[PDB]
Amino acid sequence: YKQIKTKKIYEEVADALLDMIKNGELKPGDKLDSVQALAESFQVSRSAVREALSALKAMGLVEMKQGEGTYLKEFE
Ligand code: NA
Ligand code: NA
């Protein structure tokens, strides 16, 4: 029961972001914090955050509005 999955660091970060989506902290259409801000908040490298955001992008959860920021997808 307490045989918890072990994960790579970027996967811990991706899961924390998914959690925030589920709990309504990060809402569809919201601009995500910068890589630097997320790295500091999660106590990980910029590299880990970028890999986590690539994972979310591959899940179709992320987009760009023209440019200058990463946004949670609002409309599928
Ligand atoms: Na592993
Ligand atoms: Na973490």
Author numbering: 3 to 78
From the publication, what sentences describe this entry?
We determined an X-ray structure of the free LutR–DBD (residues 2–78) by molecular replacement and refined the structure to the resolution of 1.46 Å (ESI†). The crystal belonged to the P222 space group and contained 30.8% of solvent. The asymmetric unit comprised one protein molecule, all residues of which were modeled into a well-defined electron density map, with the exception of the first six N-terminal residues representing a cloning artifact and the first native residue of the LutR–DBD. The LutR–DBD structure consists of one of the most abundant DNA-binding motifs, winged helix–turn–helix (wHTH), structurally homologous to transcriptional regulators of the MarR family. The topology of the LutR–DBD starts with an unstructured N-terminus followed by three α-helices: α1 (residues 10–25), α2 (residues 36–43) and α3 (residues 53–61), which are connected by loops. The expected β-strands folded into the wing were not revealed in our DNA-free structure. However, the formation of a dimer both in the presence and absence of DNA was confirmed by size exclusion chromatography (SEC) (ESI†).
The LutR protein represses the transcription of genes encoding enzymes for the utilization of l-lactate in Bacillus subtilis through binding to a specific DNA region. It consists of 240 amino-acid residues and forms two distinct domains: a 78 residue long N-terminal DBD and a 162-residue C-terminal EBD. Specifically, it acts as a repressor of the lutABC operon, which codes for three iron–sulfur proteins essential for l-lactate utilization, as well as the lutP gene, encoding l-lactate permease.
